[PDB]
């Protein structure tokens, strides 16, 4: 699971090396950023219901057919709507995890690995999730370094879908 600290260890272990000054600087940067990251994860968590339901609503607004069209892949049913918001929650939960982590690792391991198969196989449009991530980006109301890092992971998820 990729964080700054695990990446430093992995690579030195590749070379059979003890950690040197190089890697201790990596730890220094992790600690520098960690306040911002942990603040952002807490901000997102405490406003999770609004963002998630807001982002789901934003997808339905942008793609109206997703609430009308026939199919277990659409939000045309009570249950289908439930699934959708759930995926959007998973996304947001992952963004928080990356923030706690200081890296994309949680998202890579838990969400991004095999996503394309899931979306192909269940006929889910990447463009739906892209919109929601864009909505969350617009609406979290974070500022400073927290917003920048949070947006790095939201944007990382859009690159992953694009």
């Amino acid at each position: 699971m990729k964080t700054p600290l695990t990446e430093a260890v992995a690579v030195a272990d590749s070379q059979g090396r003890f950690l040197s000054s190089t890697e201790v600087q990596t730890a220094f940067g992790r600690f520098r950023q960690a306040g911002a990251s942990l603040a952002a994860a807490k901000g997102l968590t405490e406003k999770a219901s609004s963002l998630t339901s807001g982002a789901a609503q934003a997808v339905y607004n942008k793609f109206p057919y997703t609430t009308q069209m026939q199919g277990p892949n659409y939000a045309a049913t009570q249950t289908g709507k439930d699934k959708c918001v759930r995926d959007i929650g998973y996304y947001l939960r992952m963004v928080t995890y990356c923030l706690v982590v200081g890296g994309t690792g949680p998202m890579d391991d838990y969400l991004i690995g095999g996503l394309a198969e899931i979306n192909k196989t269940f006929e889910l449009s990447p463009s739906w999730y892209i919109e929601a991530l864009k909505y969350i980006k617009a609406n979290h109301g974070l500022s400073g370094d927290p917003a920048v890092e949070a947006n790095s992971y939201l944007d990382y998820a859009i690159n992953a879908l694009s």
């Binding site: 699971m1 964080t3 600290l5 695990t6 430093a8 260890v9 992995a10 272990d13 003890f18 950690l19 040197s20 000054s21 890697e23 201790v24 730890a27 220094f28 992790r30 600690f31 960690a34 306040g35 942990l38 994860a41 807490k42 968590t45 999770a48 939960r93 928080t96 995890y97 706690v100 982590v101 200081g102 690792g105 949680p106 838990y110």
Partner: protein, 172 residues
């Protein structure tokens, strides 16, 4: 491998949960003590040649049958292998005190090592006395009050002690 932060994350994901504000509080605590944690990595690593050599020297003095002909550390190859073993373990310990989590030590070092030593005929208890020796020396070096800003490194020392004991338990 995990680190302090991804450990709590994996535990949370297993539960479909966000991290609790209390959990974050504990991580911010680890971060605020990050300078000291480096120092520990830096000092052990900086003195790791001393630590492997001194702990091995002592082990052989305490268990002379190891370096006697027929012994498990007899012959340069077997001695080299042993010294390498002490080094590898100390290296993985430093990785754990650096990451703030034990999984790297478990996964890439300790897992299956006991069985490896039984198959090989290596005395796992002996390896463990040597790990215990490296622990005392690493802590004395790490916990030294000279040439450094005075403060409390008590949490980290218990935590470093844990990784050593965990490594010693695995080879047993």
């Amino acid at each position: 491998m995990f680190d302090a932060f991804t450990k709590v994350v994996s535990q949370a994901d297993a539960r479909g949960a966000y991290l609790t504000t209390d959990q974050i509080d504990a991580l911010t605590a680890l971060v605020s003590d990050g300078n000291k944690r480096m120092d520990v990595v830096n000092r052990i690593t900086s003195n790791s040649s001393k630590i492997v050599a001194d702990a091995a020297r002592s082990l052989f003095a305490e268990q002379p049958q190891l370096i006697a002909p027929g012994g498990n550390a007899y012959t340069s190859r077997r001695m080299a292998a042993c010294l390498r073993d002490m080094e590898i373990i100390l290296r993985y310990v430093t990785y754990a005190i650096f990451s703030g989590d034990a999984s790297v030590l478990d996964d890439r070092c300790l897992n299956g090592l006991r069985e490896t030593y039984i198959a090989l005929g290596t005395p796992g208890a002996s390896v463990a006395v040597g790990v215990e020796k490296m622990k005392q020396a690493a802590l004395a070096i790490a916990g030294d009050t000279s040439g450094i800003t005075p403060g409390d490194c008590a949490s980290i020392m218990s935590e470093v002690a844990s990784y050593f004991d965990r490594a010693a338990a695995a080879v047993a």
